[PDB]
Amino acid sequence: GVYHREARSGKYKLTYAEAKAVCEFEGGHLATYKQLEAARKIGFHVCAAGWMAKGRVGYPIVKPGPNCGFGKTGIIDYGIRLNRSERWDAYCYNPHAK
Structure with missing residues (x-):
């Protein structure tokens, strides 16, 4: 399933370029609206922009x-x-589940 992530030594210090670096490495892909929706139907609720x-x-x-x-x-x-250019959170995805 999907999950939220935030800076360990801070808060909102993750950019798009960075989010792409941590992910996609193992062939994964950043979560999108279409993919996110499929999760909402599972009771997924996260109030945060990334x-x-x-x-x-x-x-x-x-x-x-x-x-x-x-x-x-x-x-x-x-x-x-x-x-x-602004600083914001970031989302990811993994084939671990769902």
């Missing part, structure tokens, strides 16, 4: 999301942001 394939970034949420974005419900990705 870089992904094609510089894509988003913070999927079943309903609650005060800290992330502002109210509203359901994923609210902007579809590839130009803030590729």
